[PDB]
Design an enzyme around this catalytic site. Sequence first.
Site, PDB file in Angstrom:
ATOM      1  N   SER A 127       0.946  -1.105   0.000  1.00 60.00           N
ATOM      2  CA  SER A 127       0.000   0.000   0.000  1.00 60.00           C
ATOM      3  C   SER A 127       1.007   1.176   0.000  1.00 60.00           C
ATOM      4  O   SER A 127       1.048   2.013  -0.947  1.00 60.00           O
ATOM      5  CB  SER A 127      -1.038   0.032   1.072  1.00 60.00           C
ATOM      6  OG  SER A 127      -0.854   0.844   2.214  1.00 60.00           O
ATOM      7  N   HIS A 163      -5.716  -3.833   0.465  1.00 54.11           N
ATOM      8  CA  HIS A 163      -5.952  -5.036   1.258  1.00 54.11           C
ATOM      9  C   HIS A 163      -6.980  -6.019   0.765  1.00 54.11           C
ATOM     10  O   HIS A 163      -6.817  -7.217   1.094  1.00 54.11           O
ATOM     11  CB  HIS A 163      -6.192  -4.592   2.739  1.00 54.11           C
ATOM     12  CG  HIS A 163      -4.881  -3.995   3.210  1.00 54.11           C
ATOM     13  ND1 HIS A 163      -4.335  -4.172   4.462  1.00 54.11           N
ATOM     14  CD2 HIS A 163      -4.006  -3.259   2.477  1.00 54.11           C
ATOM     15  CE1 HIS A 163      -3.173  -3.539   4.474  1.00 54.11           C
ATOM     16  NE2 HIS A 163      -2.951  -2.985   3.299  1.00 54.11           N
ATOM     17  N   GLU A 221      -9.364   0.378   5.939  1.00 54.46           N
ATOM     18  CA  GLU A 221      -9.523  -0.470   7.120  1.00 54.46           C
ATOM     19  C   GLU A 221     -10.471   0.073   8.183  1.00 54.46           C
ATOM     20  O   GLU A 221     -10.340   1.183   8.665  1.00 54.46           O
ATOM     21  CB  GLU A 221      -8.207  -0.592   7.900  1.00 54.46           C
ATOM     22  CG  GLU A 221      -6.833  -0.776   7.228  1.00 54.46           C
ATOM     23  CD  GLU A 221      -5.791  -0.903   8.327  1.00 54.46           C
ATOM     24  OE1 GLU A 221      -6.449  -0.867   9.419  1.00 54.46           O
ATOM     25  OE2 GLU A 221      -4.600  -1.049   8.237  1.00 54.46           O
ATOM     26  N   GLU A 272      -5.562  -9.001   5.555  1.00 55.97           N
ATOM     27  CA  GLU A 272      -5.325  -8.966   7.002  1.00 55.97           C
ATOM     28  C   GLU A 272      -6.347  -9.768   7.778  1.00 55.97           C
ATOM     29  O   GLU A 272      -6.496  -9.637   8.992  1.00 55.97           O
ATOM     30  CB  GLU A 272      -5.289  -7.517   7.434  1.00 55.97           C
ATOM     31  CG  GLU A 272      -4.313  -6.648   6.607  1.00 55.97           C
ATOM     32  CD  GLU A 272      -3.886  -5.497   7.503  1.00 55.97           C
ATOM     33  OE1 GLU A 272      -4.591  -5.226   8.473  1.00 55.97           O
ATOM     34  OE2 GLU A 272      -2.830  -4.955   7.163  1.00 55.97           O
ATOM     35  N   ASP A 321      -8.686   3.543   9.127  1.00 58.33           N
ATOM     36  CA  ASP A 321      -7.482   3.634   8.318  1.00 58.33           C
ATOM     37  C   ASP A 321      -8.047   4.034   6.924  1.00 58.33           C
ATOM     38  O   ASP A 321      -8.528   3.216   6.092  1.00 58.33           O
ATOM     39  CB  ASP A 321      -6.558   2.436   8.190  1.00 58.33           C
ATOM     40  CG  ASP A 321      -5.255   2.866   7.509  1.00 58.33           C
ATOM     41  OD1 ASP A 321      -5.186   4.095   7.238  1.00 58.33           O
ATOM     42  OD2 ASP A 321      -4.326   2.097   7.259  1.00 58.33           O
ATOM     43  N   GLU A 366      -6.655   6.983  11.064  1.00 53.98           N
ATOM     44  CA  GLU A 366      -5.332   6.858  10.501  1.00 53.98           C
ATOM     45  C   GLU A 366      -5.313   7.439   9.082  1.00 53.98           C
ATOM     46  O   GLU A 366      -6.174   7.065   8.287  1.00 53.98           O
ATOM     47  CB  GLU A 366      -4.894   5.409  10.355  1.00 53.98           C
ATOM     48  CG  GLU A 366      -3.400   5.202  10.217  1.00 53.98           C
ATOM     49  CD  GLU A 366      -2.999   3.840   9.718  1.00 53.98           C
ATOM     50  OE1 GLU A 366      -3.422   2.950  10.486  1.00 53.98           O
ATOM     51  OE2 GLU A 366      -2.357   3.741   8.683  1.00 53.98           O
ATOM     52  N   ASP A 401       0.502   7.507   9.215  1.00 56.27           N
ATOM     53  CA  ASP A 401       1.083   6.277   8.623  1.00 56.27           C
ATOM     54  C   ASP A 401       1.990   6.833   7.517  1.00 56.27           C
ATOM     55  O   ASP A 401       3.160   7.112   7.834  1.00 56.27           O
ATOM     56  CB  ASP A 401       0.028   5.306   8.193  1.00 56.27           C
ATOM     57  CG  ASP A 401       0.505   3.972   7.646  1.00 56.27           C
ATOM     58  OD1 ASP A 401       1.712   3.685   7.625  1.00 56.27           O
ATOM     59  OD2 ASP A 401      -0.399   3.192   7.263  1.00 56.27           O
ATOM     60  N   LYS A 436       6.167   1.508  11.974  1.00 65.06           N
ATOM     61  CA  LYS A 436       6.470   0.287  11.212  1.00 65.06           C
ATOM     62  C   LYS A 436       7.992   0.065  11.202  1.00 65.06           C
ATOM     63  O   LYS A 436       8.731   0.887  10.583  1.00 65.06           O
ATOM     64  CB  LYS A 436       5.889   0.385   9.814  1.00 65.06           C
ATOM     65  CG  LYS A 436       4.378   0.456   9.871  1.00 65.06           C
ATOM     66  CD  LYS A 436       3.773   0.559   8.474  1.00 65.06           C
ATOM     67  CE  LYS A 436       2.241   0.394   8.533  1.00 65.06           C
ATOM     68  NZ  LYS A 436       1.759   0.635   7.154  1.00 65.06           N
ATOM     69  N   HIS A 486       1.909  -3.976  11.954  1.00 67.85           N
ATOM     70  CA  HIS A 486       2.255  -5.106  11.116  1.00 67.85           C
ATOM     71  C   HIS A 486       2.185  -4.499   9.702  1.00 67.85           C
ATOM     72  O   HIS A 486       2.139  -3.280   9.561  1.00 67.85           O
ATOM     73  CB  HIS A 486       1.172  -6.192  11.148  1.00 67.85           C
ATOM     74  CG  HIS A 486      -0.185  -5.657  10.763  1.00 67.85           C
ATOM     75  ND1 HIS A 486      -1.095  -6.356  10.003  1.00 67.85           N
ATOM     76  CD2 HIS A 486      -0.773  -4.462  11.057  1.00 67.85           C
ATOM     77  CE1 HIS A 486      -2.203  -5.639   9.850  1.00 67.85           C
ATOM     78  NE2 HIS A 486      -2.023  -4.511  10.494  1.00 67.85           N
ATOM     79  N   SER A 534       0.498  -5.792   5.597  1.00 68.02           N
ATOM     80  CA  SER A 534      -0.423  -6.617   4.815  1.00 68.02           C
ATOM     81  C   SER A 534       0.284  -7.939   4.550  1.00 68.02           C
ATOM     82  O   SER A 534      -0.390  -8.965   4.356  1.00 68.02           O
ATOM     83  CB  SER A 534      -0.682  -5.916   3.487  1.00 68.02           C
ATOM     84  OG  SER A 534       0.476  -6.023   2.655  1.00 68.02           O
ATOM     85  N   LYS A 551      -1.709  -2.748  16.013  1.00 69.35           N
ATOM     86  CA  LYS A 551      -2.554  -3.007  14.812  1.00 69.35           C
ATOM     87  C   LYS A 551      -1.921  -4.300  14.295  1.00 69.35           C
ATOM     88  O   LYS A 551      -0.832  -4.213  13.694  1.00 69.35           O
ATOM     89  CB  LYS A 551      -2.470  -1.820  13.903  1.00 69.35           C
ATOM     90  CG  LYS A 551      -2.941  -1.613  12.532  1.00 69.35           C
ATOM     91  CD  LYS A 551      -2.291  -0.517  11.672  1.00 69.35           C
ATOM     92  CE  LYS A 551      -3.150  -0.478  10.418  1.00 69.35           C
ATOM     93  NZ  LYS A 551      -3.353   0.826   9.745  1.00 69.35           N
TER      94      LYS A 551
HETATM   95  F     F Z   1      -1.646   0.492   7.681  1.00 63.17           F
HETATM   96 MG    MG Z   2      -2.261   2.373   7.144  1.00 64.61          MG
END
Ligand code: F
Ligand code: MG
Lengths: 436, 436
Positions: A39, A159, A168, A211, A246, A295, A320, A345, A373, A375, A396
Amino acid sequence: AVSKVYARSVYDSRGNPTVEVELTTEKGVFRSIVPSGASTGVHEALEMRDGDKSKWMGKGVLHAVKNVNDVIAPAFVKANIDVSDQKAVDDFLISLDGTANKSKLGANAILGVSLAASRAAAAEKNVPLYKHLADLSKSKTSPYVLPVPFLNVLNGGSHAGGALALQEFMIAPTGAKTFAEALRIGSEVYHNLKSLTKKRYGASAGNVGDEGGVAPNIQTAEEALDLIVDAIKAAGHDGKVKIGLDCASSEFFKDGKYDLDFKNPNSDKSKWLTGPQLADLYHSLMKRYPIVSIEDPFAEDDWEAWSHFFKTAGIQIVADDLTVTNPKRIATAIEKKAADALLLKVNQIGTLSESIKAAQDSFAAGWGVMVSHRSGETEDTFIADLVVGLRTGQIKTGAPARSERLAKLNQLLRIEEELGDNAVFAGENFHHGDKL
Amino acid sequence: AVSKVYARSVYDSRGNPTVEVELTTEKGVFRSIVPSGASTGVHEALEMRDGDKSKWMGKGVLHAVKNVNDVIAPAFVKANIDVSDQKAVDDFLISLDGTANKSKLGANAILGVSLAASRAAAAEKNVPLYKHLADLSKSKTSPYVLPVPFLNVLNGGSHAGGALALQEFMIAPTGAKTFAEALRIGSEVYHNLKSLTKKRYGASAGNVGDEGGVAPNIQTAEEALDLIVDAIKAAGHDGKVKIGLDCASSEFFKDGKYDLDFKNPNSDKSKWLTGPQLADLYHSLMKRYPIVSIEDPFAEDDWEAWSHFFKTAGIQIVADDLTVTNPKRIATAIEKKAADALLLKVNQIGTLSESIKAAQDSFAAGWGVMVSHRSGETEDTFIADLVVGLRTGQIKTGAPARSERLAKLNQLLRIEEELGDNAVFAGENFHHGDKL
Ligand SMILES: [F-]
Ligand SMILES: [Mg+2]
Ligand SMILES: [F-]
Ligand SMILES: [Mg+2]
């Protein structure tokens, strides 16, 4: 003493290859597999693919393995670096690379010696990783804070294949009183959901996403938000479960307008909304729903829509794609007040040390930190120990489905049970878990 | 010396709880999580649920945990049983239960001390599990046989919401020359597949099933078989990849006829086919496709259709629901020649020992043995070592997607790499891998 750094290729939750690094000291073989998101935003350190269309759709990582086996490997055995010295490991590793986006050796190449070395210090101070991570980041230890798992129950962006735009829709059992209880509620909300979805939508709408979320071919947000509510009622956990979004807005960011149907496609720009209009969309959503986290509402560089939005928020705003786990860019978001939460991340920056650093900088400015995490995850359970380690209170790690997800949650049960009275659940204080 | 048998509840690939058993000896803590299938046939040992609609949709396993913590646990520390003695462990465990379908303590309760104890003997003889398992089952060791992974790429039964009847369409990279190569081909065929599916069918048809397969809303077999072919061509691996079917026929078995649309529903019995007519269906399919394995063509007790079918087979016939990993029922299938392959499910019988026994009995009669997972798997990687351990050459561990699947395949890469020249890939001799 580090005796032999080796790397091999293995598979990720989505079937693509990734890097597995095996570090061997006098105490055993420490391992770590590397995540991979897809993504992603522009400013993320670099994951180096083989580019060879004829092998693994050219997503191989044959090279990155080579960066570790014939390059990093030898330097290191010999540099005789003290693995307790995360910073010294990272540092050697950055320098080896001599580039700013780990584009020389590729971040997939490095992250891996990093993590792996953190497990070898642990084995050596003779403490559980969470405690190690606790040390590295100078975080309290009395109690540890098990976090509210933000479980992605319905997926709708890179996703999952479907018409849904926001990426999300996460449920948060923050009302729960222990980690094992929250995990029990979410599974419940989750299962209820699989059903309302296969009912209103079709047997096929019960199939998951990347996910492990449900991927109904919904269209608007409301429709999916209403779907989570219904299962939240169905389940009997009303008021105990909060929602998290998200938007992954970088993705339908175009001509300076956001396209909610970045797939219509005869989408009427007469519709494309400006920053302030999405600002109203979300308020609409926010007053009508148990929404506590959002997010990436705006795209990765639309700083103006963030600061504007942020001022009248009244809720947690997570960066993010705007901050890509970079102190550099965090600095900008703090100054500009684009937010108050940092999605962290590890693979977005490449080293344990820079990430721990991403979190401190966030904590000193009053922000919270949700550990994430990707995807494309693996059976590695490291985020589990880092979320506890940093004492943030929000992780998450996906839906209670597909084991590259559960391996993290199952790991969190084990920590809770382990710590006894020495652990507290962030609960409603997800946001400021660190110093709780 | 066994010092402390403990059990806790944790989550499975589908979000349902299951049993995790931690065995502690003087060499450490050995662990094992228990699988759970959900399609299953009648004659399978018993997995005991909590039945409490108010917790985990009453699929909790709060009890089974209790069978281990307050019952089995104490007997065992004290019985001072030698973990090298699988049989003696199993045996104590069977007797504890005193029932034939482990309905007293529940098979989920026992399997777990079993597996876990096998890992503790390993740690103790100071050898890798595969070697342990090798010992237990008196199987050759020079070479070990890495098996052809039968990867379930398109799902269509209990496994996925859609109109498709046959339950599993598996690809087999038996043409490959090493395990790492076969795994590379399948990922390829797999990825190609995600695409032809999202193309012909819709973004939504790219969503997976329980075993990480694609769940197109196909209807007939042909349509899905043609879909696998196309990606097999797309991928450039033509002739190197074979197909495998899991009809899971127990499921559309009714009034003595098989209903290919056990969901039509104004299904015309004028259509429901008899044993001999399905017999022709499959021949049709068999001559037109690179089909080498067919699992449960006929329902779990339609012995007549098996023996009849079997005589003109010319291919591998696998017994899942007909033999439920039971020597008892295997005996019947050998005598009656209903088949030549045994899908082996450790949780279908409850003890390591009875399973190893399921395999010997199968090998002595000339059958092959494909070691299987379940729709509801965990991050535990035990089947990986047992498939190598028994030296069968065929494992069903799902698609190269969703990590409760990959954790097994990633484990197989590690064994291959480990064994060096001491390992050979069954290849085209999947069927008789044991004594190869
Ligand atoms: F994400
Ligand atoms: Mg995100
Ligand atoms: F099966
Ligand atoms: Mg089957």
